[PDB]
Design a protein around this motif. Structure first.
Motif, PDB file in Angstrom:
ATOM      1  N   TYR A 195      -1.871  13.289   2.831  1.00  0.00           N
ATOM      2  CA  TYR A 195      -0.903  13.564   3.815  1.00  0.00           C
ATOM      3  C   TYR A 195      -1.050  12.848   5.102  1.00  0.00           C
ATOM      4  N   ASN A 196      -2.348  12.859   5.565  1.00  0.00           N
ATOM      5  CA  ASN A 196      -2.987  12.198   6.651  1.00  0.00           C
ATOM      6  C   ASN A 196      -3.000  10.515   6.439  1.00  0.00           C
ATOM      7  N   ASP A 197      -3.155  10.232   5.141  1.00  0.00           N
ATOM      8  CA  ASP A 197      -3.082   8.783   4.645  1.00  0.00           C
ATOM      9  C   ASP A 197      -1.729   8.288   4.998  1.00  0.00           C
ATOM     10  N   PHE A 198      -0.562   8.913   4.869  1.00  0.00           N
ATOM     11  CA  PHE A 198       0.797   8.785   4.944  1.00  0.00           C
ATOM     12  C   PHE A 198       0.824   8.149   6.593  1.00  0.00           C
ATOM     13  N   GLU A 199       0.387   9.159   7.167  1.00  0.00           N
ATOM     14  CA  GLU A 199       0.453   8.928   8.778  1.00  0.00           C
ATOM     15  C   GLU A 199      -0.202   7.800   9.180  1.00  0.00           C
ATOM     16  N   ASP A 251      -9.525  -3.498   5.104  1.00  0.00           N
ATOM     17  CA  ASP A 251     -10.629  -2.255   4.955  1.00  0.00           C
ATOM     18  C   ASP A 251      -9.898  -1.223   4.888  1.00  0.00           C
ATOM     19  N   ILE A 252      -9.042  -0.754   5.840  1.00  0.00           N
ATOM     20  CA  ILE A 252      -8.180   0.360   5.764  1.00  0.00           C
ATOM     21  C   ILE A 252      -7.154   0.571   4.608  1.00  0.00           C
ATOM     22  N   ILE A 253      -6.496  -0.354   4.334  1.00  0.00           N
ATOM     23  CA  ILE A 253      -5.701  -0.267   3.150  1.00  0.00           C
ATOM     24  C   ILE A 253      -6.268  -0.073   1.879  1.00  0.00           C
ATOM     25  N   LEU A 254      -7.532  -0.649   1.687  1.00  0.00           N
ATOM     26  CA  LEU A 254      -8.279  -0.687   0.364  1.00  0.00           C
ATOM     27  C   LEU A 254      -8.917   0.868   0.307  1.00  0.00           C
ATOM     28  N   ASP A 255      -9.411   1.257   1.411  1.00  0.00           N
ATOM     29  CA  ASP A 255     -10.070   2.818   1.810  1.00  0.00           C
ATOM     30  C   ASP A 255      -8.776   3.739   1.355  1.00  0.00           C
ATOM     31  N   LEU A 256      -7.442   3.406   1.895  1.00  0.00           N
ATOM     32  CA  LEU A 256      -6.434   4.420   1.739  1.00  0.00           C
ATOM     33  C   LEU A 256      -6.010   4.383  -0.064  1.00  0.00           C
ATOM     34  N   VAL A 257      -6.044   3.179  -0.594  1.00  0.00           N
ATOM     35  CA  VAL A 257      -5.736   3.204  -2.061  1.00  0.00           C
ATOM     36  C   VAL A 257      -6.677   3.971  -3.049  1.00  0.00           C
ATOM     37  N   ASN A 258      -8.078   3.479  -2.733  1.00  0.00           N
ATOM     38  CA  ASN A 258      -9.204   4.060  -3.427  1.00  0.00           C
ATOM     39  C   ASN A 258      -9.179   5.596  -3.195  1.00  0.00           C
ATOM     40  N   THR A 259      -9.198   6.062  -1.798  1.00  0.00           N
ATOM     41  CA  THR A 259      -8.998   7.706  -1.638  1.00  0.00           C
ATOM     42  C   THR A 259      -7.990   8.330  -2.466  1.00  0.00           C
ATOM     43  N   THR A 260      -6.666   7.597  -2.707  1.00  0.00           N
ATOM     44  CA  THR A 260      -5.635   8.397  -3.492  1.00  0.00           C
ATOM     45  C   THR A 260      -5.881   8.366  -4.706  1.00  0.00           C
ATOM     46  N   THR A 261      -6.651   7.384  -5.503  1.00  0.00           N
ATOM     47  CA  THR A 261      -7.066   7.480  -6.829  1.00  0.00           C
ATOM     48  C   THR A 261      -7.894   8.442  -7.012  1.00  0.00           C
ATOM     49  N   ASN A 262      -8.872   8.584  -5.999  1.00  0.00           N
ATOM     50  CA  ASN A 262     -10.022   9.474  -6.060  1.00  0.00           C
ATOM     51  C   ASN A 262      -9.396  11.079  -5.827  1.00  0.00           C
ATOM     52  N   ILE A 263      -8.832  11.189  -4.943  1.00  0.00           N
ATOM     53  CA  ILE A 263      -8.040  12.565  -4.918  1.00  0.00           C
ATOM     54  C   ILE A 263      -7.435  12.789  -6.083  1.00  0.00           C
ATOM     55  N   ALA A 309       0.788  -1.290   0.093  1.00  0.00           N
ATOM     56  CA  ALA A 309       0.161   0.099   0.139  1.00  0.00           C
ATOM     57  C   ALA A 309       0.825   1.401   0.063  1.00  0.00           C
ATOM     58  N   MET A 310       1.981   1.337   0.863  1.00  0.00           N
ATOM     59  CA  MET A 310       2.810   2.498   1.000  1.00  0.00           C
ATOM     60  C   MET A 310       3.420   2.747  -0.474  1.00  0.00           C
ATOM     61  N   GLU A 311       3.809   1.921  -1.392  1.00  0.00           N
ATOM     62  CA  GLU A 311       4.424   1.901  -2.370  1.00  0.00           C
ATOM     63  C   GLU A 311       3.583   2.250  -3.701  1.00  0.00           C
ATOM     64  N   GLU A 312       2.447   1.661  -3.985  1.00  0.00           N
ATOM     65  CA  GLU A 312       1.356   2.020  -4.921  1.00  0.00           C
ATOM     66  C   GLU A 312       1.119   3.539  -4.727  1.00  0.00           C
ATOM     67  N   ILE A 313       0.684   3.945  -3.408  1.00  0.00           N
ATOM     68  CA  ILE A 313       0.151   5.256  -3.095  1.00  0.00           C
ATOM     69  C   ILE A 313       1.350   6.063  -3.690  1.00  0.00           C
ATOM     70  N   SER A 367       1.482   4.302  10.761  1.00  0.00           N
ATOM     71  CA  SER A 367       1.328   3.589  12.024  1.00  0.00           C
ATOM     72  C   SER A 367       0.609   2.302  11.879  1.00  0.00           C
ATOM     73  N   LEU A 368       0.177   1.858  10.675  1.00  0.00           N
ATOM     74  CA  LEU A 368      -0.086   0.400  10.482  1.00  0.00           C
ATOM     75  C   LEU A 368       1.255  -0.318  10.563  1.00  0.00           C
ATOM     76  N   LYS A 369       2.208   0.138   9.714  1.00  0.00           N
ATOM     77  CA  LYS A 369       3.714  -0.407   9.641  1.00  0.00           C
ATOM     78  C   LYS A 369       4.011  -0.345  11.042  1.00  0.00           C
ATOM     79  N   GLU A 370       3.958   0.671  11.879  1.00  0.00           N
ATOM     80  CA  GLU A 370       4.740   0.488  13.294  1.00  0.00           C
ATOM     81  C   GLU A 370       4.349  -0.428  14.031  1.00  0.00           C
TER      82      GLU A 370
END
Length: 211
Positions: free
Chosen positions: A139-143, A194-206, A112-116, A147-150
């Motif tokens: 920018y919050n998505d990165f955060e 769920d959260i990963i998919l939400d973060l990928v989709n959001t990125t494409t949408n934005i 997810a971090m690298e696709e984004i 926090s998922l990696k950590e």
């Protein structure tokens, strides 16, 4: 707007840093023994229910690398995790959870971090065209990603410590299985997923409006 200029910059640094790291890591290669993990794990599990060869194959070089990066390419930690998880993977009732843990948790977060980051950098000139609510979210998505990696890094280290600290983790694979499970509940996978998919989709949408 001077705040906007900063956000772009910080987002572009965060995206640049993830791609640089991934190429450096990628040139590290790995031993034939895949950091000890190949004999009992990678050569016994499949990437997804649709795959044909096991995860040790040349076809999963990339995915293996993303998994190692997900643990910061700390070869020592990778190797120690792997010796413990091999004890579980030697038991076919516990091998599923090993795979799920490595792939659906550690691999998935790193991917997810690298696709984004590739998404964002593929439109790097046109980010100033963006609303500042969007610039904040990405920018919050990165955060949240960090926090998922950590927490993956934290559960990994604790597992290594609990194992080294407690001899029946070492001699009783069922108890070993329960301790892995405690940090990886079935709902906790679905949530992570769920959260990963939400973060990928959001990125494409934005980013749709600047492609």
């Amino acid at each position: 707007d001077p705040e906007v200029a900063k956000l772009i910059q910080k987002i572009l640094d965060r995206s640049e840093n993830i791609i640089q790291i991934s190429e450096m890591d990628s040139s590290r290669g790995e031993p034939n023994d895949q950091f000890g993990m190949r004999a009992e794990i990678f050569s016994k599990i499949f990437f997804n229910a649709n795959s044909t060869v096991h995860f040790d194959s040349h076809e999963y070089t990339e995915e293996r690398r993303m998994l190692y990066t997900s643990l910061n390419f700390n070869e020592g930690k990778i190797f120690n995790l792997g010796q413990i998880l091999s004890k579980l993977s030697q038991d076919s009732n516990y091998r599923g959870l090993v795979k799920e843990t490595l792939i659906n948790r550690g691999f998935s977060i790193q991917l997810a971090m690298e696709e984004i980051s590739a998404k964002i950098l593929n439109v790097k000139d046109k980010l100033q065209q963006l609303n500042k609510p969007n610039l904040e979210t990405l920018y919050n998505d990165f955060e949240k990603l960090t926090s998922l990696k950590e927490k993956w890094l934290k559960d990994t280290d604790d597992l290594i410590d609990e194992y080294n600290t407690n001899p029946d983790l070492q001699t009783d694979v069922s108890k070993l299985n329960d301790t892995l499970r405690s940090k990886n509940s079935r709902a906790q996978f679905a949530n992570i997923h769920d959260i990963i998919l939400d973060l990928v989709n959001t990125t494409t949408n934005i980013l749709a409006p600047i492609q």
